[PDB]
Amino acid sequence: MNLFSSLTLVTLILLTMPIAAINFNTHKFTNYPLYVKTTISCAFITSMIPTMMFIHTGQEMIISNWHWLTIQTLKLSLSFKMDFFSMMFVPVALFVTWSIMEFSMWYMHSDPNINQFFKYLLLFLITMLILVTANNLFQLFIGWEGVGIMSFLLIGWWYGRTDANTAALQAILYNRIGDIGFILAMAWFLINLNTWDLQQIFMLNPNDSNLPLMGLILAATGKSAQFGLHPWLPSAMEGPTPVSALLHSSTMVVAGIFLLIRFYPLTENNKFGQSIMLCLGAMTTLFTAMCALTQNDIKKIIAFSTSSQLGLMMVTIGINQPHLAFLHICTHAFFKAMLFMCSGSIIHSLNDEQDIRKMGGLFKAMPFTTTALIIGSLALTGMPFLTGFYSKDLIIESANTSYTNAWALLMTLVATSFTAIYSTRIIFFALLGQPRFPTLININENNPFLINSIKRLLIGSLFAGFIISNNIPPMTIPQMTMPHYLKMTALTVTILGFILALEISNTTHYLKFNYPSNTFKFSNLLGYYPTIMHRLTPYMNLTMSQKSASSLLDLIWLETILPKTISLAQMKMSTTITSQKGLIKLYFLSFLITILISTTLLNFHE
């Protein structure tokens, strides 16, 4: 007990110490990014011990160490839930963040505000581990809004750029729309169960949990870029490459998925919520992987890749397999962070070029980036016995062999083929073929920061699926008996995707020119949704906000009814009183009329 809780809190306090260091500074640092990278490496080391002694026994505890507030029956405490989810996500996120920061010491080197960048990146890590370790909804909301605000600050990093500010405000918009449902869930649990703690939620175990689970699905739609609230994540590639690699691939965008996995004892008892999650996840993994097929910016292709994998995670939550979904989070982190790091290595080596149509021939000019990008693409598509296999193969073999929405399953398999298609699109245009970049070759991947940072996630992408799948305990009963066309579904559909896209990419060398079909313009313009809605909804909101609200109500009508009409009425009565002609005859004639009215008409003499 004493070792587990101590190293648990020492991990988080160790991560907060460089924030005190960057705030209590006078000098220019002796390499503060090296200090934060060393701190996160040592925090990974510190977090490995409670993980090992969870793998030994299954040891879990709650650390409710600080009573913060008591609202008459709601004792709010700083409470840390050290369960399977925290024990398997904290070292994965620390290992990935350690590799992202050693990548960042190379990528963000010429930036004169590199200390602010590492401060912001560590603040994201602190808020994310506040999110994933929280035991009540208030502290989880703190980590939730914290990763939202650090998402803002890291998307709009180059704040002179209009598109960065626009994409950051977009991300805040979609995440606050998800926060509507998050606060709906908090309100429901407080009113109907008198708690925000997960323990009383799980022990009271409500049956009419349709509405709070709808709120949690809305929160995960906002946070994990599901359909309807998806377009902030491809816009979120406007920030720097380590921002994308850490936050918007592996660590931040799995938080809504982590929220719905965190409420697995309530989603396991609600078939309506499982069907909603299944249809939403299949919709997302179809639509975003369909958008990724005809994109040209490499970071957009990998952002639609990670939103397709988030749709797949929402699918496997929807089939009552939450631990497979969390395994796929911890699996997806390694190779998707490494895919963004390889793409950023290409971007730096080709002088800030992010377009795959100006690449090629990097199979030999960038051999290590090529090796790791091929390995990450194979782990993304579900090559056998890499890290992506031990999650994605089980997700497909469990979504097939279950009482399932059949259209959701069929769109899941079409998405599985599309993953292979856009992965070999990345490999074809970025690596293979002939060079299309400009003529001054400054290709160089010879920094040990870059080599080591890709190397550790490369060892992760080779072995982490095997290691984690053999170290996690059984939490469900795995379906291991199925017919052979149904066992071989994912591999056959992935090979058909590779063959189909080999045909597609080899028909790009032919001397034919074809006008683009409507399916090409649909898939290339993001399914028209960031074009239609981002023009139409701000139009109807801001025209209303000016014309109705600012002008017509609160400069015209609410000013007209009470103050202006009363002022004009008292003005007019003032002019009727004092428009006398100064004639004594008329004043005494009015006095006579007064006395006549008082006698005859008002009976004041009676």
Partner: protein, 459 residues
């Protein structure tokens, strides 16, 4: 409460007998000492309110408003000493006297044991505010704004006088402590309907209610910075304080008299946030944000659950600090570009990085970032309005989305993008300005550590 009234009156000879270069430093120092002394009011008990005399008492509602009021005076002196630097010495002492006198009225407004003393002090707070706006306001519209500020409040409050003297003749007393035990139910009649309106409409104007808020984006804009600070931080909260006192007497008629005003405020928090999305004046954007935040406090008082009162008093204190800091940031740019147009000075993070950090933190507290007491008050009001009706979560969430939108739109517009080329008098941030920003923000962040002293009488 006399140990706070007497030093505030002794600030008058302290500001009139000071040396001509010492009249800011002495008033700042001794008002900081009064603000240090204000913490003795935290002697609160779970059963009894801290009842001083026949005239003064302080429960856990009036105590945070008192500490915020006594804390606001040195910060108003710091904010207002740069643009009144070239002023006459006598007019400078008159400005400081109006600030000290407004604090003197407020600290015995919140502690008024008897309600007509509350009314006299409550309407006494108009006169120094009116003199500050119409005398040391900058543009032409300050006279019209003083007219609107005076004649909405008195139009609302002169029925309140007749209502309170009626309660004095009926119950025999307007002592709030006696009326905690002699309160009778107020049944349904037209007489009691207009009783409810006469007791509530003055405070609805002071909050302000949506539809009656038209005094506010002219009084808060056309005031100087000390006027804007006190109007945003204390003088809107006089209305919520009076509501939380006077709704003791208005039961059970409030349970159906509240519906039109709950509709007005639940729709006004949407409409005024939408107005904030399309403001060209930065100071007016902060004014309509204040209307949008006080709409929730109106809903929380009118639904009168304990969670709603706790969230309303937390949101009143949090909004006082946040809106005062937003007006001070707006003044820090107005003292450089000499225009309140928000689109004029752009890209200011490239020029003033630490001042842009203060902009970031005040915009984060404006959007209710947890665990700030902004989010605590916001969240408790949302809990209580959800328990009121489950469909109010749509309006509360849509308000939170638009609130985040105009907060970060304000931040991006003033601080981000390419800087304005033809503006070259952007000085570095003075130590006075950064100290003002930190003395707003650091108590607002430290109150997240121990938030129980701002959750009212029924924490």
């Amino acid at each position: 409460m006399l140990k706070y009234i007497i030093p505030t009156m002794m600030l008058m000879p302290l500001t009139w007998l000071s040396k001509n270069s010492m009249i800011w430093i002495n008033t700042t120092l001794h008002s900081l000492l009064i603000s240090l002394t204000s913490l003795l009011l935290l002697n609160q008990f779970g059963d009894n309110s801290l009842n001083f005399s026949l005239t003064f008492f302080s429960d856990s509602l009036s105590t945070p408003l008192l500490i915020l009021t006594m804390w606001l005076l040195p910060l108003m002196l710091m904010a207002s000493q740069h643009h009144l630097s070239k002023e006459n010495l006598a007019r400078k002492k008159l400005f400081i006297s109006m600030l000290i006198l407004l604090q003197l009225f407020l600290i015995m407004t919140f502690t008024a044991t008897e309600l007509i003393f509350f009314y006299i002090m409550f309407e006494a707070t108009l006169v120094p505010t009116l003199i500050i706006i119409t005398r040391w306001g900058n543009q032409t519209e300050r006279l019209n704004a003083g007219l609107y500020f005076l004649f909405y409040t008195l139009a609302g409050s002169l029925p309140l006088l007749v209502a309170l003297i009626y309660i004095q003749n009926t119950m025999g007393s307007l002592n709030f402590l006696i009326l905690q035990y002699w309160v009778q139910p107020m049944p349904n009649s037209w007489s009691n309907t207009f009783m409810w309106l006469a007791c509530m409409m003055a405070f609805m104007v002071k909050m302000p209610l949506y539809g009656l808020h038209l005094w506010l984006p002219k009084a808060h804009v056309e005031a100087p910075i000390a006027g804007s600070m006190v109007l945003a931080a204390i003088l809107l909260k006089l209305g919520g304080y009076g509501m939380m006192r006077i709704t003791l007497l208005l039961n059970p008629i409030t349970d159906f008299m509240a519906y039109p005003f709950i509709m007005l405020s639940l729709w006004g928090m949407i409409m005024t946030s939408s107005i904030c999305l399309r403001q060209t004046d930065l100071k007016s954007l902060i004014a309509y944000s204040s209307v949008s935040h006080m709409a929730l406090v109106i809903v929380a008082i009118l639904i009168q659950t304990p969670w709603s009162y706790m969230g309303a008093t937390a949101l009143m204190i949090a909004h006082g600090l946040t809106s005062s800091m937003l007006f001070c940031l707006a003044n820090s740019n107005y003292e450089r570009v000499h225009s309140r147009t928000m689109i004029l000075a752009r890209g200011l993070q490239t020029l003033l990085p630490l001042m842009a950090a203060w902009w970031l933190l005040a915009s984060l507290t404006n959007l209710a970032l947890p665990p700030s007491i902004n989010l605590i008050g916001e969240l408790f009001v949302v809990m209580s309005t959800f328990s009121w009706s489950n469909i109010t979560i749509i309006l509360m969430g849509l308000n939170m989305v638009i609130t985040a939108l105009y907060s970060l739109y304000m931040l991006i517009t003033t601080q981000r993008g390419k800087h304005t080329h033809h503006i070259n008098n952007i000085l570095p941030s003075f130590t006075r300005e950064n100290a003002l920003m930190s003395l707003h923000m650091l108590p607002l962040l430290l109150l997240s550590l121990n938030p129980k002293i701002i959750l009212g009488p029924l924490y």
